[PDB]
UniProtKB/Swiss-Prot annotation:
Effect of residue 164 to L: In strain: Gamma/P.1
Residues of the full protein shown: 1025 to 1191 of 7096
Regulation: Inhibited in vitro by GRL-0617.
Main function: Responsible for the cleavages located at the N-terminus of the replicase polyprotein. Participates together with nsp4 in the assembly of virally-induced cytoplasmic double-membrane vesicles necessary for viral replication. Antagonizes innate immune induction of type I interferon by blocking the phosphorylation, dimerization and subsequent nuclear translocation of host IRF3. Also prevents host NF-kappa-B signaling. In addition, PL-PRO possesses a deubiquitinating/deISGylating activity and processes both 'Lys-48'- and 'Lys-63'-linked polyubiquitin chains from cellular substrates.
Source organism of the structure: Severe acute respiratory syndrome coronavirus 2
Residue span, Macro domain: 1-167
Oligomeric and partner information: May form homohexamers. Interacts with N protein.
Location relative to the cell: Host endoplasmic reticulum membrane
Name assigned to this protein: Papain-like protease nsp3
Membrane topology: Multi-pass membrane protein
Reaction it catalyzes: Thiol-dependent hydrolysis of ester, thioester, amide, peptide and isopeptide bonds formed by the C-terminal Gly of ubiquitin (a 76-residue protein attached to proteins as an intracellular targeting signal)
Length: 167
């Protein structure tokens, strides 16, 4: 039993909800919140920009130190950093950005990072400003993640379309 509330159960391990991931994180304080990161951990917009704003830019400060030490992530890769006031940890995961020409096959690799964590609150990778089809992203998530994933979907219209079209 965990503290996630009001989710629709999609499969054995995947749950979905129409919710702002920022407000969901602040209420649940999950062990792991997933950020829709880029390789430079520059959290300017989308889910990343919103999560960082909620940390009063502490996420960005921590991220800049991480990059200065380690260099950029790989597309499809991840790193674990602090969750600040939102979660114990933030798993920064880089899904491919279609608006940069990045290979969509890397979306499966991106979701594989979730399997290193027993329970996660996450957005749909490569959705929103990353330019991929959120329906496809959900399919890859379901077919790749084996740990317990709670998806927060910001747009109510998109949430209903995801549910109604789910196979
Ligand atoms: N669950 C959730 N998702 C977010 N994003 C941003 C927009 C897209 C649609 C294009 C990509 C995704 C929809 O879920 C993911 C945000 C941003 C702020 N808060 C959020 N909360």
């Amino acid at each position: 039993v965990n503290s996630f509330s009001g989710y629709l159960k999609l499969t054995d391990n995947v749950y979905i909800k129409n919710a702002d991931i920022v407000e969901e994180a602040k209420k649940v304080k999950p062990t792991v919140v997933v950020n829709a990161a880029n390789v430079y951990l520059k959290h300017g917009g989308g889910v990343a920009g919103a999560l960082n704003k909620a940390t009063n830019n502490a996420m960005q400060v921590e991220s800049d130190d991480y990059i200065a030490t380690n260099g950029p992530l790989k597309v499809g890769g991840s790193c674990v950093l602090s969750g600040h006031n939102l979660a114990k940890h933030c798993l920064h995961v880089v899904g491919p950005n279609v608006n940069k020409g990045e290979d969509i096959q890397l979306l499966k690799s991106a979701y594989e990072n979730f399997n290193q964590h027993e329970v996660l609150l996450a957005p749909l990778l490569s959705a929103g400003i990353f330019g991929a089809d959120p329906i496809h992203s959900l399919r890859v998530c379901v077919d790749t993640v084996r740990t317990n994933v709670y998806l927060a979907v910001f747009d109510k219209n998109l949430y209903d379309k995801l549910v109604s079209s789910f196979l």
